[PDB]
Assembly symmetry: D3
Homo-oligomer: 152 residues x 6
């Protein structure tokens, strides 16, 4: 069992692709418990052209989305192990979002850390909760539940 999971590994599990794959690396994975990953925030991202001009602030909902993706990594894997074939048939459905609070704006230069831990699961359904952090300080908090749907 490996510790870190790089972009190539991520591409092999999550179905998300540019410009919606918002997780760059996985520094810690504990099946069925807690995942710690991150996405680098640079100014060279199309999203900054509109949010907002002359004041780049990484969208709050995209922080949520990032945590949701970090969680999804937990789901797919825990549910099948690091297996790209069994993962290529799925996608991830967002079911609920709760108790999310944004505390510090994220901007170019910040290492957006996703700290999530499972809270409950079953089948393709999983509920995860946690925070997003920059340089150790909390930037956001959230709870969300998702399903690993079928491409069909």
């Amino acid at each position: 069992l490996q510790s870190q999971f790089f972009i190539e590994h991520i591409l092999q599990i999550l179905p998300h692709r540019y410009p919606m794959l918002l997780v760059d690396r996985i520094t810690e994975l504990q099946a069925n418990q807690k995942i710690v990953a991150y996405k680098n925030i640079t100014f060279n991202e199309d999203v900054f052209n509109g949010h907002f001009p002359n004041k780049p602030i990484f969208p709050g909902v995209l922080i949520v989305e990032g945590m949701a993706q970090s969680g999804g990594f937990l789901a797919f894997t825990s549910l099948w192990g690091f297996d790209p074939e069994i993962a290529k048939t799925k996608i991830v459905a967002f079911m609920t979002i709760d108790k999310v609070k944004f505390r510090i704006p994220v901007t170019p230069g910040d290492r957006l850390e996703y700290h999530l831990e499972v809270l409950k699961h079953k089948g393709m359904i999983w509920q995860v909760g946690g925070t997003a952090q920059v340089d150790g300080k909390v930037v956001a908090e959230a709870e969300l539940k998702a399903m690993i749907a079928e491409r069909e």
Copy 2:
């Protein structure tokens, strides 16, 4: 005015491409409610990655879309149609709560945003409501955001 088109939204809201997710405004009640909408089309960059071969408007972006409609209701409530101020402000998400996604939103759908204020208090606003495609609740959520100074 009770209806507004993209021209006005561009003058009021600080958001721009690719983060302005509201096209037209159909109802507005200062300090009360506002319904609006955003057309979803395949000709949008997000669909390149969400998800290849299976385009699905990101759930988080439906929420953003509802937050913007609120922001527009908020801004006009505090200053009226005022382009010179809007450029001095930005919107900032505070919290998001009890948001549920029920039917996926796809290219071809007229994504309606229905919101009503629940807590007005100053710059800080709080609204709740649903997103609807063809008279059907596709999502629901409550959110709070602050219209604060730019810098």
Copy 3:
């Protein structure tokens, strides 16, 4: 097989972002006619330069959509719904004539494509029809296109 959604459209037409301008086929009748549409939203790249501070959907893209709708008509009319014969048949534009733009299309409009066959000769199709938004005609044209081999 009367209503076709974006999913079905990707499997028939070779066009992809940012040049697939048809979001859903609402009517289709072999070798005769097709009714489809594409939603116009602000979150489209084209709007960054046409025109800044005044989003106007390009008339030529409206023609492009009508042609693409017609191409869907050709493909299915000639081979029913076949996702692979289609992976080997681009859509080349031959002529356009009698086109007229009447009402500017903008973000928030549903652009409906109404086309009928004027003449079919193998893979050389001549069509004609209009472009409508919320009831009124917005553009009208006639065009010819060939569904040649992809190489």
Copy 4:
């Protein structure tokens, strides 16, 4: 009213912007007469991602759009000469198009040359006709009427 114009000049005159500004240079111009300009076609254009994957073709409709923009340049400069403060207050709108023929496909590498003569003009409404040429060969034929409107 010089005869040759570079993108720098085109920007101040035409309201069109990326990714809808399809004229890089003006080779020749004669008030209310004719205009010759061109647009280089490269693979490095977003339009090519979808038209068509694995087979790059510059859309015919854009060739038409390009000629319309050339006429526009010509019309702007004819109506008011080289003037950026009046131009800033205008937009160009397509009125009609007729007798367009697409003879040869345009692809990355080709130098898309536009050729237009004025068929009729009165006020903001201008009518022009001509061809689009690559290496001398007539790639396409087109006729169109466009108007200059106040951005208001």
Copy 5:
């Protein structure tokens, strides 16, 4: 083999894709010897939205990148002839860059031409040098050593 290649061919040999495929057509080619190709520069390129606003200047570094790809096409072609199947398995790593000189700026409407000659070469390593030219004039000269490393 050949000595004239278009974008369909280029695409079949080099792994670069949008927005980093900076070579449109190969006009001249001599195995092991030299190579001449070009890329059309047009305002309808994303890079101009920022380099620079209201003053389009094709990035100097991108001129260099264009010469390396041209060198890469030449290298690949020299090593295996025209072979898409085998090329399909390679990447092009940049090794060293030297004696890079920018003389004239490259702007929209220019025909950025690549002139490369093979200095040294052993395995999947080729040190080449040449110049970038627009209208016969040398807009830049440079040297580099790329790497044709297998793709995985």
Copy 6:
């Protein structure tokens, strides 16, 4: 001059913009002397769509561009100081590039640190040498001569 500048400062001094502003933050700065800045590298960059499909590698040539800009920023503040004004006027333009060595491919998740120090400098022609590093190690090195045009 100061010693900590954020994208909001960089924006006000460099002319580059999306998708060519390749410097996100300036952590350390000593006028006429050196500068230490950096650009975050994420997968969410358009460039990775073509360099390369299923194997994103930040282009070495963009690493150099990022180094140049850093020096450029150093150059301006190292004469007129953080002064948006003159800045809007003048404008960076690199005339040469020497001794560029690429040692480790940069990929999404790296924090490309820019380490530049002033070298053989004229007046409007600043030369700079230094390196780009990731997690302490040297991913690349290079020397550039830049002129503050107008």
